[model samples]
Target: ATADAAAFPDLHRAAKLSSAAYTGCIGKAFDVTIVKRIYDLVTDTNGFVGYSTEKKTIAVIMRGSTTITDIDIALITPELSGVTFPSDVKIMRGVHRPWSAVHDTIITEVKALIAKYPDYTLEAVGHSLGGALTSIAHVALAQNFPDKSLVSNALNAFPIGNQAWADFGTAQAGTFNRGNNVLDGVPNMYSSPLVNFKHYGTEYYSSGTEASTVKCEGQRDKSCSAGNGMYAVTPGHIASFGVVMLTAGCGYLS
Candidate 1:
């Protein structure tokens, strides 16, 4: 089954908006001058880098986490250490650590991009582990440029199949739009009590069917998951892979 583009206009719009960045995941041809491709050998991570020339927007497109090492990082559910950006914001060590490995390089490039295109807004998008990384990057960017107006203007994150990591405050309410499949198990993990993980932003959950969509109000909406519970563990999780493929155009073939 595929997403009914007409039924959910927001998803379709997001799909269209993210199509170019998605191309970066599969090493497809795109504007080389505008888009800077990122590949880290040590972490085996990939990202599509670009920014809007006219709007002065910084876009960081990250690839999903893959490989045993990547999965291992997901399991390392601990708060980051020695980073004093914000104490209340605690992220998963697994995703944060790998992101940290390549942090300097990413920051350097972004700083250069900002210099070239002053007063730029930041936009981040990623799927699965990539989504987690996007969150980390967004937070880092926000903290780094707290006073910049563009940062606030473009402080938006779109993470698909994202695993819960931090409990964001009310101040970050509308900045994130987390998309989850009703059956996807990845987004259900790291709940509170057991782990200090909480999802921030509004949730958009799809039934993995042609026309099933739900825009849950506020974070951690119980109506969005299967079993009406914190986590959803079902075969729908795998089906979500296809849903995101069609909806986000993650690896769409031309």
Candidate 2:
């Protein structure tokens, strides 16, 4: 796998193809940029000293402490690799179970990292497919690290679970922030009323025509208003990728 990975340096880049069908509906081209922005933010503000592009993980140290005694770890779940899901009611193969299984590995790795660091919180971030994975990661982490803070920012992501699972995940995390951008309109996925979470803390939601569209359907009343107007800024086609690449912060401990 290592050699194969080395041969395809841009394998990760091509993985973005999963969102190809929804490119027109959502700013698919800009998704990568948004992911990067989130990663960057985690490192800058949290004082997490180090990070890894290959492992897709970040190390954060508590503020005012050196010596790596008090650090935090944030891991970005890998995208669907080469998998894509149609926005339909039918369940995707390897989704319900593998999704949770992958998160198990993520939580285990976070725990091992915590053991190495000894005193740090655990947080996670993911966009699109990764966003869904992060949802599971957050829940697993919360169960293991109750006293630690679990910050998860899901950008242009669909519902991670069904009505019941979604509700349980949100309640367990205590704070699950959803970024409502125009590029996030997935037919049955977002249109369904399964999602039940709040938008708060530093995880701001952008508002405007480009940011999000009305939840109401029917072409007759197609309005580009954010209805609630709670978003932090307007999300444009350019803004999607920009948010991932530019705004994504990280936490690294040096």
Candidate 3:
């Protein structure tokens, strides 16, 4: 499902590596850069971009606030083998419930990729589910590469957890950049420490229609968009925090 490089250079390069990591281990394959597939499932889907030093280890981006069930239904047709309830239940239990075996495969593949391209760095970006997974994976990757710098762009996702959870997860996630609209409603349940990174968030969800906040709610200052609109989500903050994540090489230079 990898796209033509010339057509979608950013997506193609990153997704090819992601596809290799996913398919090389999990026989059931997924089509990369399925923009239509994404749009059909999620409402008004947004996008994010991340850079990696290793050609094989590209940035990871989740499509939307899609749930694990949504991913299973959309991507996992019954035809895929070894997909029984008991066979691999606990494995896919994360934000997207990606299998643990898949995690192992990605780690091995990423390490190999890093070895091949030692001068490369890694970054992750995602809108909703993508954001959550990016958060989890960021910590995982950072723990794996303590010396390397890792930055994650987690946009408009349900709160990761409590303060302890956020601290534990993000301390390993390297530099974290988050964005959520105050009107988004995802972060209302969880405490602010979970998402109150030095930089990120908006007064409310930038999307006009989805802009509804009530009940123990409205931390508009937490929203990344002081003035910017939905357009001012993760990408906007990435541009704002460009200096911290991508400046001097954690190996961006060779």
Clashes of each: 0, 48, 17
Sorted on TM-score, best first, the list reads: 1, 3, 2
Q: Give the lowest summed-lDDT range of ten residues in model 2.
A: 64-73
TM-scores, all models, native as reference: 0.66, 0.45, 0.46
Compose the digit string of candidate 1's lDDT tens values, residues 1-254. Answer: 23333435544333333443445444332222245677777776777667655445666666554421224423343333223433334455556666777666676677788788777766666656666676666665655555443221111122222333344322432255565665455666655454435666556666654367666665556676523453433445433412343244433453
> What are the Cα lDDT values of the candidates?
0.51, 0.34, 0.37
Ranking by lDDT: 1, 3, 2
- Candidate 2 regions exceeding 4 Å error are 1-94, 187-190, 193-203, 207-241, 244-254
Segments in model 3 whose C-alpha atoms lie over 4 Å from true places: 1-57, 65-96, 99-101, 181-183, 189-254
Model 3 Cα lDDT, one tens digit per residue, 38-147: 12222333232223323323344444432222233221211112222222112123342442323444455556656666766766655445555565566666666776
